[PDB]
Design an enzyme around this catalytic site. Structure first.
Site, PDB file in Angstrom:
ATOM      1  N   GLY A  56     168.988 -20.561  40.847  1.00 10.86           N
ATOM      2  CA  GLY A  56     169.962 -21.477  41.645  1.00 10.86           C
ATOM      3  C   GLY A  56     171.260 -20.270  41.726  1.00 10.86           C
ATOM      4  O   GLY A  56     172.200 -20.505  42.514  1.00 10.86           O
TER       5      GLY A  56
ATOM      6  N   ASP B  23     166.639  -6.967  48.479  1.00 12.32           N
ATOM      7  CA  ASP B  23     167.124  -8.706  48.477  1.00 12.32           C
ATOM      8  C   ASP B  23     168.631  -8.822  48.850  1.00 12.32           C
ATOM      9  O   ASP B  23     169.394  -9.058  47.877  1.00 12.32           O
ATOM     10  CB  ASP B  23     166.643  -9.127  47.343  1.00 12.32           C
ATOM     11  CG  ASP B  23     166.433 -10.723  47.367  1.00 12.32           C
ATOM     12  OD1 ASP B  23     166.538 -11.047  48.395  1.00 12.32           O
ATOM     13  OD2 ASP B  23     166.288 -11.091  46.175  1.00 12.32           O
TER      14      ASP B  23
ATOM     15  N   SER C 212     170.782 -17.160  42.191  1.00 10.54           N
ATOM     16  CA  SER C 212     170.470 -15.947  43.097  1.00 10.54           C
ATOM     17  C   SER C 212     171.389 -15.996  44.345  1.00 10.54           C
ATOM     18  O   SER C 212     171.791 -16.923  44.628  1.00 10.54           O
ATOM     19  CB  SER C 212     168.940 -16.221  43.570  1.00 10.54           C
ATOM     20  OG  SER C 212     168.079 -16.061  42.323  1.00 10.54           O
ATOM     21  N   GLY C 213     171.845 -14.794  44.576  1.00  9.58           N
ATOM     22  CA  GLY C 213     172.650 -14.634  45.832  1.00  9.58           C
ATOM     23  C   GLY C 213     173.975 -14.500  45.453  1.00  9.58           C
ATOM     24  O   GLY C 213     174.973 -13.961  46.315  1.00  9.58           O
TER      25      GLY C 213
ATOM     26  N   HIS D 271     166.044 -13.801  50.081  1.00 10.10           N
ATOM     27  CA  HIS D 271     165.089 -14.435  49.602  1.00 10.10           C
ATOM     28  C   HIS D 271     165.743 -15.983  49.686  1.00 10.10           C
ATOM     29  O   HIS D 271     164.974 -16.926  49.629  1.00 10.10           O
ATOM     30  CB  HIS D 271     164.515 -14.263  48.270  1.00 10.10           C
ATOM     31  CG  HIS D 271     165.161 -14.574  47.133  1.00 10.10           C
ATOM     32  ND1 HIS D 271     165.925 -13.780  46.250  1.00 10.10           N
ATOM     33  CD2 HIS D 271     165.070 -15.558  46.532  1.00 10.10           C
ATOM     34  CE1 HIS D 271     166.501 -14.313  45.346  1.00 10.10           C
ATOM     35  NE2 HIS D 271     166.085 -15.631  45.125  1.00 10.10           N
TER      36      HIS D 271
HETATM   37  C1  5NY Z   1     168.735 -15.296  38.790  1.00 12.42           C
HETATM   38  C2  5NY Z   1     167.314 -15.966  38.456  1.00 12.42           C
HETATM   39  C3  5NY Z   1     166.627 -16.210  37.355  1.00 12.42           C
HETATM   40  C4  5NY Z   1     165.456 -16.782  36.924  1.00 12.42           C
HETATM   41  C5  5NY Z   1     164.775 -17.350  38.078  1.00 12.42           C
HETATM   42  C6  5NY Z   1     165.471 -17.220  39.327  1.00 12.42           C
HETATM   43  C7  5NY Z   1     166.488 -16.632  39.496  1.00 12.42           C
HETATM   44  C8  5NY Z   1     164.399 -17.921  40.295  1.00 12.42           C
HETATM   45  C9  5NY Z   1     164.715 -18.151  41.772  1.00 12.42           C
HETATM   46  N1  5NY Z   1     165.420 -17.792  42.562  1.00 12.42           N
HETATM   47  N2  5NY Z   1     165.610 -17.827  43.580  1.00 12.42           N
HETATM   48  N3  5NY Z   1     164.266 -18.451  43.779  1.00 12.42           N
HETATM   49  N4  5NY Z   1     163.498 -18.572  42.536  1.00 12.42           N
HETATM   50  C10 5NY Z   1     163.327 -18.274  39.295  1.00 12.42           C
HETATM   51  N5  5NY Z   1     163.662 -18.018  38.041  1.00 12.42           N
HETATM   52  C11 5NY Z   1     162.554 -18.291  37.146  1.00 12.42           C
HETATM   53  C12 5NY Z   1     161.028 -18.429  37.448  1.00 12.42           C
HETATM   54  N6  5NY Z   1     160.946 -17.147  37.916  1.00 12.42           N
HETATM   55  C13 5NY Z   1     159.838 -16.801  38.689  1.00 12.42           C
HETATM   56  O1  5NY Z   1     158.990 -17.670  38.772  1.00 12.42           O
HETATM   57  C14 5NY Z   1     159.770 -15.230  39.148  1.00 12.42           C
HETATM   58  C15 5NY Z   1     158.464 -14.602  38.946  1.00 12.42           C
HETATM   59  C16 5NY Z   1     158.465 -13.355  39.460  1.00 12.42           C
HETATM   60  C17 5NY Z   1     159.168 -12.745  40.392  1.00 12.42           C
HETATM   61  N7  5NY Z   1     158.908 -11.295  41.060  1.00 12.42           N
HETATM   62  C18 5NY Z   1     157.815 -11.032  41.031  1.00 12.42           C
HETATM   63  N8  5NY Z   1     158.031  -9.599  41.687  1.00 12.42           N
HETATM   64  N9  5NY Z   1     159.255  -9.311  41.703  1.00 12.42           N
HETATM   65  C19 5NY Z   1     159.712 -10.526  41.283  1.00 12.42           C
HETATM   66  C20 5NY Z   1     160.291 -13.537  40.674  1.00 12.42           C
HETATM   67  C21 5NY Z   1     160.661 -14.851  40.005  1.00 12.42           C
HETATM   68 CL1  5NY Z   1     162.011 -15.432  40.614  1.00 12.42          CL
HETATM   69  C22 5NY Z   1     160.188 -18.557  36.405  1.00 12.42           C
HETATM   70  C23 5NY Z   1     159.649 -17.767  35.804  1.00 12.42           C
HETATM   71  C24 5NY Z   1     158.718 -17.966  34.516  1.00 12.42           C
HETATM   72  C25 5NY Z   1     158.765 -19.409  33.985  1.00 12.42           C
HETATM   73  C26 5NY Z   1     159.410 -20.374  34.786  1.00 12.42           C
HETATM   74  C27 5NY Z   1     160.078 -20.054  35.956  1.00 12.42           C
HETATM   75  C28 5NY Z   1     161.029 -19.436  38.535  1.00 12.42           C
HETATM   76  C29 5NY Z   1     162.177 -18.927  39.965  1.00 12.42           C
END
Ligand code: 5NY
Ligand code: NA
Lengths: 235, 54
Positions: A183, A89, A185-186, A41
């Site tokens: 940030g 992923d 991730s990966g 991703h």
């Molecule tokens: C290790 C880690 C840890 C946390 C990370 C991430 C990575 C990422 C992320 N990584 N790459 N792109 N986004 C996010 N975040 C936090 C963030 N997450 C998401 O929105 C999110 C929601 C659903 C899902 N998902 C749906 N089905 N399978 C997985 C994945 C994410 Cl990343 C979020 C959730 C709730 C409220 C605010 C923000 C935003 C994006």
């Protein structure tokens, strides 16, 4: 990484950072001089990605950095972002010019499927990255690290409304305050075996970073070892 | 002496062999040591090793 500590220079010499339109949007690990393993991703909409090995402080020039361009992206053949951005992923990045291996730029070890799974069963791995240091907070300047314990499947399923498949695992703390974040991730989840680190997971995703009752979700590397070894082989 | 008990005393990998013995092994870039258990570097920068002073 929320609730982690500053790494010392050269402490995670397999760690790379991926930079694009924003810096440190993802992490990666060195497989060998020409290949990086990361999350699919991170690299699905192939923008110009720059890989930096030997990185420590992403805002300072420190002489150990080796910057390389990506010439080929290989997501896992089962990866399909139209179905699920976060299933299978994992992806491989081929670098334009080989890295120069040294004390700051060293590959991560990759065991066979059986031993990769045994090492995950030890129950404690190290994660590292330049991801957010608080939920919705700033990215780290100095590389962060954290030891995370393996969380049992049932607990992991109860923690989130989203599906977790058997090629993924949960790790974190029941009390909150310590976890991977956006940030990171990966990047690598590694298990230390008598002083030698082995890749046991890929940092995949999470929700409210480090909130009590939430856990970081990781790709189980054991499922993909044969594919990594075949695709990255230099001979 | 089996691979199920303390990994057959192998530092990295273990394989069960004839007459209740084990055969240890190592990942790429390491050599099995003379003690038949440990893994020694066989290249300048073997994988998964921290070599900078911590
Ligand atoms: C290790 C880690 C840890 C946390 C990370 C991430 C990575 C990422 C992320 N990584 N790459 N792109 N986004 C996010 N975040 C936090 C963030 N997450 C998401 O929105 C999110 C929601 C659903 C899902 N998902 C749906 N089905 N399978 C997985 C994945 C994410 Cl990343 C979020 C959730 C709730 C409220 C605010 C923000 C935003 C994006
Ligand atoms: Na730097």
């Amino acid at each position: 990484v929320v609730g982690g500590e500053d790494a010392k220079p050269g402490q995670f010499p397999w760690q790379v950072v991926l930079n694009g339109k924003v810096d440190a949007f993802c992490g990666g690990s060195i497989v060998n001089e020409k290949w990086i393993v990361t999350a699919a991703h991170c690299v699905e909409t192939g923008v110009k990605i720059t890989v930096v090995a030997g990185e420590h402080n992403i805002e300072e020039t420190e002489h150990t950095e080796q910057k390389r361009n990506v010439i080929r992206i290989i997501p896992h053949h089962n990866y399909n972002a139209a179905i699920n951005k976060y299933n299978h992923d994992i992806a491989l990045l081929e670098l334009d010019e080989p890295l120069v291996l040294n004390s700051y730029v060293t590959p991560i070890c990759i065991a066979d499927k059986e031993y990769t799974n045994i090492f995950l069963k030890f129950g404690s791995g190290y994660v590292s990255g330049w991801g957010r240091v608080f939920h919705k907070g700033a990215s780290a300047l100095v590389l962060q690290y954290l030891r995370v314990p393996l969380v049992d499947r049932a607990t992991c399923l109860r923690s989130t409304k989203f599906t977790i498949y058997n090629n993924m695992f949960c790790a974190g703390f029941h009390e909150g305050g310590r976890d991977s974040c956006q940030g990171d991730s990966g990047g690598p989840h590694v298990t230390e075996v008598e002083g030698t680190s082995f890749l046991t997971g890929i940092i995949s995703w999470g929700e409210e970073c480090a909130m009590k009752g939430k856990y970081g979700i990781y790709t189980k590397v054991s499922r993909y070892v044969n594919w990594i070894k075949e695709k990255t082989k230099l001979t | 002496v089996t691979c199920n008990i303390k990994n057959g005393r192998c530092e990295q990998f273990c394989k069960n062999s004839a007459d209740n013995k084990v055969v240890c092994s190592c990942t790429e870039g390491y050599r099995l040591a003379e003690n038949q258990k440990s893994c020694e570097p066989a290249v300048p920068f073997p994988c998964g090793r921290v070599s900078v002073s911590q």
